[PDB]
Design a protein around this nucleic acid. Sequence first.
RNA 1: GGACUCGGUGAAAUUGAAUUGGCUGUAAAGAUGCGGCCUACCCGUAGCAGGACGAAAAGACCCCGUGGAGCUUUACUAUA
RNA 2: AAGCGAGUUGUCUGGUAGGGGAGCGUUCAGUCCGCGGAGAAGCCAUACCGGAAGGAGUGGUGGAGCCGACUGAAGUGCGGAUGCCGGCAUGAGUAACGAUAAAAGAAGUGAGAAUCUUCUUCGCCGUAAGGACAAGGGUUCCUGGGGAAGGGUCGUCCGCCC
RNA 3: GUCCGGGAGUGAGGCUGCGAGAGCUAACUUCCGUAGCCGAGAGGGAAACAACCCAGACCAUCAGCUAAGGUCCCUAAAUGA
RNA 4: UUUAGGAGUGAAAAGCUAACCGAACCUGGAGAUAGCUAGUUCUCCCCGAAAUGUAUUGAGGUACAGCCUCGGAUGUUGACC
RNA 5: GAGCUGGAGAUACGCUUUGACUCGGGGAUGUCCGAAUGGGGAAACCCACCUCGUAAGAGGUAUCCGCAAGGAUGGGAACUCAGGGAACUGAAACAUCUCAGUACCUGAAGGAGAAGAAAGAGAAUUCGAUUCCGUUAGUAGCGGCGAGCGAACCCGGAUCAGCCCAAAUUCAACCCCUCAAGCCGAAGUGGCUGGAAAGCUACACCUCAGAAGGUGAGAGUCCUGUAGGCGAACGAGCGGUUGACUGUAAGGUCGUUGUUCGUGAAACGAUGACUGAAUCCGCGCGGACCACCGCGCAAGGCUAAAUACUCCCAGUGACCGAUAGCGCAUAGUACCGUGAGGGAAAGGUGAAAAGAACCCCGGGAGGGGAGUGAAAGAGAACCUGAAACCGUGGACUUACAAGCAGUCAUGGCACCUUAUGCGUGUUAUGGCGUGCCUAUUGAAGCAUGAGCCGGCGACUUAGACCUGACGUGCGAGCUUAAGUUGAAAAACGGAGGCGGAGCGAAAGCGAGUCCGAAUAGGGCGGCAUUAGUACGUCGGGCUAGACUCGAAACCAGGUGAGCUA
Lengths: 117, 63, 141
Amino acid sequence: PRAKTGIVRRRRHKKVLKRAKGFWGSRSKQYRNAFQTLLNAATYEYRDRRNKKRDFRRLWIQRINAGARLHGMNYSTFINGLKRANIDLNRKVLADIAAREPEAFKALVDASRNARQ
Amino acid sequence: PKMKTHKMAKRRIKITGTGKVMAFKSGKRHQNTGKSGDEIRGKGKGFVLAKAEWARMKLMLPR
Amino acid sequence: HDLKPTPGSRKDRKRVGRGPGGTDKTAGRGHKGQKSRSGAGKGAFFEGGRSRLIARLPKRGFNNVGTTYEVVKLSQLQDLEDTTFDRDTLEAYRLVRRKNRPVKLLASGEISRAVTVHVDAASAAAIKAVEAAGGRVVLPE
RNA sequence: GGACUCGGUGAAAUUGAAUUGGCUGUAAAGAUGCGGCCUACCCGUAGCAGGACGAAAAGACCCCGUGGAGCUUUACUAUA
RNA sequence: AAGCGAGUUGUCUGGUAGGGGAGCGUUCAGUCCGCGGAGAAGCCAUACCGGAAGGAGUGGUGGAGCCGACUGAAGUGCGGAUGCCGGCAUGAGUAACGAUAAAAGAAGUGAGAAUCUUCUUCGCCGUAAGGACAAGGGUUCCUGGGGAAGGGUCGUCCGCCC
RNA sequence: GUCCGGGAGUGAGGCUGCGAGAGCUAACUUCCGUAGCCGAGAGGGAAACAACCCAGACCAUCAGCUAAGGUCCCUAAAUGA
RNA sequence: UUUAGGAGUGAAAAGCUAACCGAACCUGGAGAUAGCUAGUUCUCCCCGAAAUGUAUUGAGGUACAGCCUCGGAUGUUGACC
RNA sequence: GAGCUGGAGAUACGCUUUGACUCGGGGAUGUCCGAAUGGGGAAACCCACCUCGUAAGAGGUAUCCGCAAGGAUGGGAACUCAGGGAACUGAAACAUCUCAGUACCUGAAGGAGAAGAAAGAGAAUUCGAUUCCGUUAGUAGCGGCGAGCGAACCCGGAUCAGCCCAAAUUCAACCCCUCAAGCCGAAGUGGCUGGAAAGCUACACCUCAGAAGGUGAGAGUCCUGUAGGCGAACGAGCGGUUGACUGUAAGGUCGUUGUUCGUGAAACGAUGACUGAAUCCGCGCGGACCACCGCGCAAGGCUAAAUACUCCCAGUGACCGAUAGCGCAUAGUACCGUGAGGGAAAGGUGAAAAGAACCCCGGGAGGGGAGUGAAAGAGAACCUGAAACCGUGGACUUACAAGCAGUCAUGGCACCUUAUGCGUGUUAUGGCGUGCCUAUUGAAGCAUGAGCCGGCGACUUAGACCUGACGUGCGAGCUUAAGUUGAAAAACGGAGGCGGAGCGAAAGCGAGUCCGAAUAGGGCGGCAUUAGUACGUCGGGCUAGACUCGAAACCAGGUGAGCUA
């Protein structure tokens, strides 16, 4: 029998206090605003590295929308121009790359523009 | 410690073995009995269905 | 010695099966409403069901005193090659030697062999077997 | 004589937590952290009550409770 | 010698009362060759692994032991039960120093002195807030002595304490 | 298609569709059954908001498309015919 | 200074017995028991609901059955067309 | 044994080696109260009256039974009864009832009293002295016929032993034998990091005796135990042969309590007023009575041994840890106070204090030097020493930006325990985004619980109470009580019940079965069949408050009424 856990229940509080990041006041060694703020850091934190696509989605729909309008451009009613080449398939990330060479739509304009008839 | 309720320790209590347990059918009997003629031939361990779980605390140790 | 091991004398021999389960302590794990606090669980004492109904109604049939119910000797492997160890005294292997309350007879029929018994019985069951197997008559009480 | 300058002492009832403005709306409709909009340089102390569904005992007015106590009546009934 | 699956298809749903099922570890006990003076156990922090819980790398500090695999036992584990005590609290430095029935000062002292002391002036009670007897407290009264603390400022005054 | 058993729950719900009952066919009032839904899971649409149009997931990728919803802006998407 | 507990006191209020007497306090009888209700502790892999009916001096009480998990099973009996 | 009498261990004072210092047992000065009792009578306090006597003051005063002295009554923590007697609860409430004869009161003695050798239990035409548990029987009965209480029939041992009202005990020699003071009791050391290391290493010795422990780092050769055995003066204590003694003189009716029996279909304990019969082949009952059997005879007790108890003296256990454990690891201090009656909180410096001379601010508390200290980040209110609150600075951002909080998101200052445009300590701001517990259909709520820290944190524990997964024992299966062994045991053990053919009210029947006038039917040995069972953790349940707690109300006893009267 017996146990006396008047010391073992220390590392417990700390094993989760790992997230003693820059919160507020002194929420790094609190003992209130820790094992609660942790329950606060216990939300979509789980899905805070996937759902984020929605956030960075709010990027290429301003650039891909109509950058160099000096051509024609439309994006939306133009995506049917993308998948109008031989083997389009791929899409984004290549938008992130589109941030480099501006000649990513020189001879890649009217090479899908009127690729209908 | 088991009391075995003697009352319903009478009636049907006997055990079978590896099939079905008995019961009691019980009609109405008593007075004005001038009709009926079937259950007249059907009275003793009239099986109920399966409600013989309650009765156990009635008896279950050296009958 | 003691470089890269851990034991030094078996006892560590596990087993090849189990036996216990998970157990419970009632009111546990820091959760669960579990069962109904209203009377049940604690004390209760009277059964965990309805009450004393459908017990009543029958007119009740007395006669339950010990009197006598007997058992049996099964009758099948005794009247064949069995010779002498089944008198009403030495036969005490399946509670036979226990006197007072009779043992009647109760046997089958046909019978292709014979034996001998300190009988002390004359039931009407083993009427199809009481001589075929063999062994006097002698009524006692 | 208390509310303001200064020396010392300063507790209790209570309480998750305040980057603690509002509308109109919405919500188990009485929302300030919600919606949509407008708006303030942040802080200290004096003073005031609309404010947190103000505080205290888990309404004791009531009902539910096969709760208790208390008094009376020829209530069933014990009883000097 | 205790049973285990890639190759693959549907299920692998999320789950409140529940079913089958794995563990992290502390205390008791087995075997202790043991692990620790370069000092482990007490504790403070560093991105290896783990189904989560947790097991890991090292110093720091600390002072004498401590846990291990196969194992069973034990009051085996919520911060959270308007709980209970122990301590820190904040209301916050504000309200308040008590019946609003005046006081100034010379001077003794010394650590500085406004409330002590030697004292001229003021005023409140004086059928009183006088003195003795009644109950009570028991150490009040003194020769006086020191602030740790108390007299809800404090003080070189007590009837604190000797 | 096919029963015996160790053990549940807690009996007091809501709404849209389906029709009546008490009813100025009034009431997330009340009774009923029948699909769903929330009591046991998140979203777009819906301003955000339990049953409504689409859709219920093994953890990780700033890879693709469908339905709703939108193609002027605050935060996506042709004021194209 | 006797009266006292289920009695006395009493100007009757149903006031008091020592700051609450609708019958003192304290040690003791049992924790009044409780279907009320607060709670009932570390971390989990696959499955899953009732406020419908019958019962009740019976109702947010409780019993059981359709309703969940598991052991065994049902050699053609499934539901759709 | 020769030295010093318990904590403010008390400096000093004083005594030694034919008895100071501590003490074993038989005694003694023994203050007020306790029975104490001269009187008063509110513990620490006041009076008469006789013996004594240099004028002072010394010997003592209270009730009961053989009565004329004396002997006894005191206070008691658990053991038997007796006068003894409710009660919350349950039956889901609810007067017979369960608690039960339990709380409490009062009487007795020994640490043993209580039943215990009889007008008896059983039942085949047997057996003797009480009780306990073992098994049965958890049967018969009881019974608002309800929960429920619950013998005898067969069993173990401690024990299987005699006599009491009218024709043994007392002092002692010897003693197997206990009781404290107490007697000896074993067997080698060096070097390091360091406090001498019992850790690294080295070899012998001690052995029927090698459990706990102290001396700075766990030691058999430093030591107390353990095996070997001893001890008187005083006495008990379990005593063995014997000396002073003499070891053989009432059933019954009516009303009811109990017993298992709530009392009625039943004798049996006994009482309220009535009957004192039988009187010996007469008499007490077999559960009322008839008939026959069985056994015992008015008339009074003793019986030690075990069963059940736990104030003290050694020793012993898979417990706690000084709010843990009894409240007490030197306190139930002070006290709460109207009264019996309720009470803390709190431990710890290292082996050892060596708890410390010497110049400073200061009234001093508190702080300097420096030894002490192996080690003084032990530190003269003292181990290590985590934390809400609380103490300061710094690398960075910030008042013009708005939501308790969030996570990511480009930037933004810092760093680079691996130039490797890669990260560590972070933020203006963006999507927006409402907490947890948890009795809730139901919210994110203002629905409630929450300032924090440290712990307590509950359906389990004994019970053949039962059913069931797995592993195993067996297929003809499995054991209680303790008697012998006895730091494990254990075989020996059929008391015994459960499984077992069944059905039937049962009787009894029968491998087949209740119906009656009986091939047609439900169950069964049966059966295209397990006939099993014991141990363990375990599904639910059970006998108990036994998931805990929160209620005003019912009771026994006891305490003041100085509060209002």
